[PDB]
Design a protein around this nucleic acid. Structure first.
Ligand SMILES: [Mg+2]
Ligand SMILES: [Mg+2]
Ligand SMILES: [Mg+2]
Ligand SMILES: [Mg+2]
Ligand SMILES: [Mg+2]
Ligand SMILES: [Mg+2]
Ligand SMILES: [Mg+2]
Ligand SMILES: [Mg+2]
Ligand SMILES: [Mg+2]
Ligand SMILES: [Mg+2]
Ligand SMILES: [Mg+2]
Ligand SMILES: [Mg+2]
Ligand SMILES: [Mg+2]
Ligand SMILES: [Mg+2]
Ligand SMILES: [Mg+2]
Ligand SMILES: [Mg+2]
Ligand SMILES: [Mg+2]
Ligand SMILES: [Mg+2]
Ligand SMILES: [Mg+2]
Ligand SMILES: [Mg+2]
Ligand SMILES: [Mg+2]
Ligand SMILES: [Mg+2]
Ligand SMILES: [Mg+2]
Ligand SMILES: [Mg+2]
Ligand SMILES: [Mg+2]
Ligand SMILES: [Mg+2]
Ligand SMILES: [Mg+2]
Ligand SMILES: [Mg+2]
Ligand SMILES: [Mg+2]
Ligand SMILES: [Mg+2]
Ligand SMILES: [Mg+2]
Ligand SMILES: [Mg+2]
Ligand SMILES: [Zn+2]
Lengths: 37, 23, 133, 136, 126, 176, 192
RNA sequence: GCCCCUAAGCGUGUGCUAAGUGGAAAAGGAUGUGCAGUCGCGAAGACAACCAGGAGGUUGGCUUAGAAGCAGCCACCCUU
RNA sequence: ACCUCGAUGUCGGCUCGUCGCAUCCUGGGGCUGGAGCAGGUCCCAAGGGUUGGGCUGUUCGCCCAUUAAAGCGGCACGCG
């Protein structure tokens, strides 16, 4: 779970979601899982 | 640095019209 | 149902061949002897062989024709292809060799006639960059 | 690092930051260019950083133009010294960039790679900037 | 895909039918381009084997008396225009369906009649 | 919305009661309750259908519409058929048994572990390794299935633990 | 070359000045000045949106029919005032024309073609000068590049001119310069 | 300045915001949302989803233990 | 160079503490170039705890034995 002020779709399987007022990225690969913060 | 921020920002009071003495 | 390219008078190397289909569960010795007999009935060409694999491990060899670029490399007489196709024109290819290679690849192609095969061969020679006139 | 060969006066006043660019406001050499949005001083190192960033990206072919030269100097006086006792000595060589100016110019076949290269360049700059083509 | 390209395809398929003596409509869902290209070797000798979008075909089929083939557009549409002689395409498709078993023939058309599987097999035998 | 504009059919073995925004459905599997939101209007088409309607197409209306429609559809499907989930476990000596209604697992820890089927859900073990869970509520069935799945830590190396059947686990190789 | 005149409505300005111009730009009106051989300067206002659309459709050098209080007048877009930053249209310059008039016009040249892969082509002269007729001014002049190799210099002469079209610029202008593509080494050398 | 502290408006009409933003802040990141606008495709049925394919030359040439559509470089071609 | 020169005592150490978390240990997680053991890095977490000596006025630093650990900081570089 990366936590960075920037979040980007590393691979095209990545999707960008907003949960509870914060932006994160979900993907099948757990490496690409990241959060904007 | 908080105090300078406070004073320079209270300069923006609608009555002060963007100016206060001593910045 | 896998594919490899193996030379005319060569068989049983460790890196390219052995583990390549030994992890496919296929008998390597019988394939080696049969392909060797067939390719020494060819006498002259590196051949792409396709292994067709079954559940009981029985195998069948599909002997397509020697590769079109390899056929053009042996056709133009040069051992090595070009490093910069259309810029470094190492050799030359004639339309009669084009027609012979067109017949062979007609045996290998989806081409219906000679001219389509010749055009395919022209594209193949261009891919590696040998002058075609 | 581009440094002017010689200057008539080595110690100058600061280049004043009022107004928008009048000249150099159009793309003139390459297919694309970078247009500046802020007021700034741009140093040697920023320019060479951005230029190497472009060159690494486009790699093979295409040519780049640099429309601005860092010929106005800026001095600094040695640290641990009080105020006064004369002006400092020049260290860093800058150019005065106003909004509307075009900084870098590119001639390259592919559009997407070009935009990516200019984006890599822009990220190296201290100012807001945008990509402008020769189409109106 | 744009409407101009669809109109061009409609006109061209109509023209190819007016040059065709009879037609066969089949389903291809479940075959690969390998055996399909082998079929184009087989069918490309005399007839013509193609595939078109049904909404394109019905504007292409409204031209001639193949307006009776609108009800055979259900499922993927593979059209065999028999140009050389008449029966070649039917028997070739019948043998290709016997070997593959992945084809279903929606029907055929000729002589002012659109005809079902049994009648096509009759003409394929006759 | 787009989903929320498909009527919910009422099969014959189904009984429906509507009280304003409240809804209740009774069938062979039992009775279930539901409540819809203020923006959404609920009607029963006398042809044995359910109609979900919204006055507006703003954010709240659009989002809530399909939600409510699918929710009532799930509610009726629960009392018509029900809900069934399948579990199946991997690992040597990984033991699953039923004690009455309660489920017992032995997944390699020193002690065995127990889980209790809440009211409205039942367990059925047919193999020592795999079993199933039946229930009225889709949400409750999913919840219990999830908590069952969570019991053992995921293993990309040897893949020990409980699994759903359809799911596939990512697996790396510990080379060293 | 026969292009249709474009129909725009103009209304004569009531006030002139920076305040009037700012006010007019504020509500979607663009100020223009009509001056020609008629020696009558008209300060007019145009719809910004429609004028911009006409410009986009038919380039910078477009021939216009203006509706000065019912009067249909032929005019030419002699010059445009664009903001350097937000790309508006600030002011327009319109030249009265009668049919069959010799006109001096900047026309954009566009380079199309497939140069050889080891070639980079640079478009050096952005726009070229033409003497033509008011009703027959091109929108673009096309230069084709195929098989261009080594240093292939295309000057202003080689551009094909249709009937009634005359080249005013000196034909030496390198409109397109064909050069060797810069190397992976050459790029790391310029600017250092 | 006008809800109460605290004198005067929990004023009227049309919108906007969900962040207590209001009632501090950068590069930069981001399917929040409103308004307005340009281009594409779309009933000849568009997009999404549901089902069938995505073949042959060929493993294109160099480099390479190795290079086969998937470390790298050049062209970026041909049939059904 | 804005308070203090008709006085605002200045380093280390001792006694006594109080607060911040930018967490040293203990607690909870995510990812791994995480087989296990043992790790790396990021997030949450301030309840409690965090040694005794040799040299140096020393701060600091090195060293000797241990410990789960021998945290960093502000409070007139706390406190005559
Ligand atoms: Mg980053
Ligand atoms: Mg500070
Ligand atoms: Mg000030
Ligand atoms: Mg001045
Ligand atoms: Mg300029
Ligand atoms: Mg100037
Ligand atoms: Mg910047
Ligand atoms: Mg009061
Ligand atoms: Mg008020
Ligand atoms: Mg009120
Ligand atoms: Mg009010
Ligand atoms: Mg606030
Ligand atoms: Mg901010
Ligand atoms: Mg951004
Ligand atoms: Mg291939
Ligand atoms: Mg490879
Ligand atoms: Mg004193
Ligand atoms: Mg005193
Ligand atoms: Mg004293
Ligand atoms: Mg203390
Ligand atoms: Mg913390
Ligand atoms: Mg922990
Ligand atoms: Mg951890
Ligand atoms: Mg603590
Ligand atoms: Mg407590
Ligand atoms: Mg402290
Ligand atoms: Mg003190
Ligand atoms: Mg201290
Ligand atoms: Mg002290
Ligand atoms: Mg004392
Ligand atoms: Mg003391
Ligand atoms: Mg004291
Ligand atoms: Zn991903």
């Amino acid at each position: 779970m990366k936590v960075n002020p920037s979040v980007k779709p590393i691979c095209d399987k990545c999707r960008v979601i907003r949960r509870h007022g914060r932006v994160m990225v979900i993907c099948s690969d757990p490496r690409h899982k990241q959060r904007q913060g | 640095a908080k105090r300078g921020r406070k004073k320079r920002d209270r300069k923006h009071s609608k009555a002060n019209h963007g100016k206060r003495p001593n910045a | 149902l896998i594919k490899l390219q193996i030379q005319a008078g060569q068989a049983n190397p460790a890196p390219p061949v052995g583990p390549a289909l030994g992890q496919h569960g296929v008998n390597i010795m019988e394939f080696c002897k049969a392909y060797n007999a067939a390719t020494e009935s060819q006498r002259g060409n590196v051949i792409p062989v396709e292994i067709t694999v079954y559940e009981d491990r029985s195998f069948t060899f599909a002997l397509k024709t020697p590769p079109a670029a390899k056929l053009l490399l042996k056709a133009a007489g040069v051992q090595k292809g070009s490093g910069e196709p259309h810029k470094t024109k190492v050799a030359k290819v004639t339309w009669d060799q084009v027609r012979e290679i067109a017949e062979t690849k007609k045996a290998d192609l989806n081409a219906n006639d000679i001219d389509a095969a010749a055009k395919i061969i022209a594209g193949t020679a261009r891919s590696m960059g040998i002058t075609v006139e | 690092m581009l440094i002017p060969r010689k200057v008539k006066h080595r110690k100058q006043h600061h280049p004043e930051q009022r107004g928008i660019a009048s000249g150099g406001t159009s793309v003139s050499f390459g297919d694309y260019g970078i247009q500046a949005l802020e007021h700034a001083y741009i140093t040697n190192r920023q320019i060479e950083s951005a230029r190497i960033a472009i060159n690494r990206h486009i790699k093979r072919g295409g040519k780049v133009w640099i429309n601005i030269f860092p010929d106005r100097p800026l001095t600094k006086k040695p640290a641990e010294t009080r105020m006064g006792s004369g002006k400092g000595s020049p260290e860093w060589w800058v150019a005065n960039v106003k909004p509307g100016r075009v900084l870098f110019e590119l001639s390259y076949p592919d559009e997407k790679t070009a935009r990516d290269a200019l984006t890599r360049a822009i990220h190296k700059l201290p100012i807001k900037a945008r990509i402008v083509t020769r189409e109106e | 895909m744009a409407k101009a390209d669809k109109a061009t395809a409609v006109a061209d398929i109509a023209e190819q039918f007016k040059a065709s003596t009879a037609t066969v409509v089949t389903e291809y869902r479940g075959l690969t381009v390998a055996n399909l290209a082998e079929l184009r070797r087989a069918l490309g000798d005399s007839a013509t084997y193609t595939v078109a979008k049904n909404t394109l075909v019905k504007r292409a089929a409204s031209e001639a008396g193949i307006e009776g083939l609108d009800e055979l557009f259900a499922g993927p549409t593979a059209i065999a225009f028999v140009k050389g002689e008449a029966v070649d395409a039917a028997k070739a498709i019948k043998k290709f369906a016997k070997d593959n078993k992945a084809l279903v023939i929606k029907g055929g058309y000729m002589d002012g009649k659109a005809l079902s599987v049994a009648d096509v097999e009759k003409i394929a035998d006759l | 919305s787009r989903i929320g504009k498909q009527p919910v059919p009422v099969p014959s073995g189904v009984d429906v009661t509507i009280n304003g925004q409240n809804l209740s459905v009774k069938g062979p599997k039992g009775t279930l309750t539901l409540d819809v939101a203020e923006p959404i209007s609920v009607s029963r088409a006398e042809d044995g259908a359910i109609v979900v309607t919204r006055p507006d197409d703003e954010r709240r209306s659009r989002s809530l519409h399909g939600l409510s429609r699918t929710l009532i559809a799930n509610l009726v499907t629960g009392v018509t058929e029900g809900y069934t989930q399948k579990m199946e476990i991997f690992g040597v000596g990984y033991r699953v048994q039923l004690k009455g209604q309660n489920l017992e697992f032995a997944l390699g820890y020193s002690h065995p572990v127990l889980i209790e089927a809440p009211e409205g859900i039942t367990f059925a073990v047919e193999s020592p390794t795999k079993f199933s869970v039946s229930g009225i509520d889709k949400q409750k069935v999913g919840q219990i299935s999830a908590v069952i799945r969570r019991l053992r830590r995921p293993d990309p190396y040897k893949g020990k633990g409980v699994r759903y059947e359809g799911e596939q686990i990512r697996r790396k190789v510990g080379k060293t | 070359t026969a292009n249709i005149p474009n129909k725009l409505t103009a209304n004569v300005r009531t006030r002139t000045g920076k305040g009037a111009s700012r006010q007019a730009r504020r509500d979607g009106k663009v100020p223009a000045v009509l001056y020609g051989h008629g020696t009558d300067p008209q300060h007019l206002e145009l719809n910004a949106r429609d004028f911009a659309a006409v410009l986009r459709s038919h380039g910078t050098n477009a021939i216009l029919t203006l509706d000065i209080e019912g009067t249909e007048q032929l005019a030419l877009t002699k010059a445009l005032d664009v903001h350097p930053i937000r790309r508006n249209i600030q002011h327009a310059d319109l030249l009265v024309v009668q049919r069959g008039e010799k006109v001096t016009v900047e026309v954009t040249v566009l380079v199309e073609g497939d140069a050889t892969p080891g070639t980079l082509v640079t478009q050096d002269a952005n726009t070229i000068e033409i003497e033509a007729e008011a009703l027959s001014i091109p929108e673009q002049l096309t230069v084709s590049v195929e098989g261009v190799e080594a240093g292939t210099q295309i000057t202003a002469g080689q551009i094909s001119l249709p009937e009634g079209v005359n080249l005013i610029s000196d034909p030496e202008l390198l409109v397109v310069n064909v050069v060797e593509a810069p190397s992976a080494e050459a790029l790391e050398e310029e600017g250092a």
